[PDB]
Copies of this chain bind each other. A is one copy, B any other.
Amino acid sequence: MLVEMRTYRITAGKVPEFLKIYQDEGLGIITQYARLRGCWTQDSGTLNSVVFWWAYDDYSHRAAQRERLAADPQWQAFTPRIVPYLEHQESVFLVPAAFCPD
């Protein structure tokens, strides 16, 4: 397995707005293609930050599912709604330790 951890720094004060738009409009689309294991806001360090945990079987399943997501007309119609909130985006790849629970 493989987790992609993606962190979005949002326009100050606008995190609740971003999360409503994401929840009402994006969640149903993207979860057709990737397994969400967690969505969080930061309570320490850099505030106004939303952390997503995406789970894939491996890099090639990830690459294939991300293409099918990119090609989705619904998804392409959705991202312009969140883009104005996105100040900064980052991504880290994680591979489980031997004792990682699944």
Q: Please report A residues at the B interface, Cβ cutoff 8 Å.
A: 2-3, 19, 23, 27, 36-45, 50-51, 91-101
Q: Report the bound CA distance from A98 to B45 in whole Å.
A: 21
The listed residue with most B CB atoms (<10 A of its CB), out of A2, A91, A94, A96, is A94
A43→B95 contact, CB < 8 A: yes
Residues of B with C-beta under 8 A to A44? 91-93
A37→B95 contact, CB < 8 A: no
A97→B42 contact, CB < 8 A: no
A3→B40 contact, CB < 8 A: yes
Residues of B with C-beta under 8 A to A97? 19, 23, 39-41, 50
Residues of B with C-beta under 8 A to A38? 3, 96, 100-101
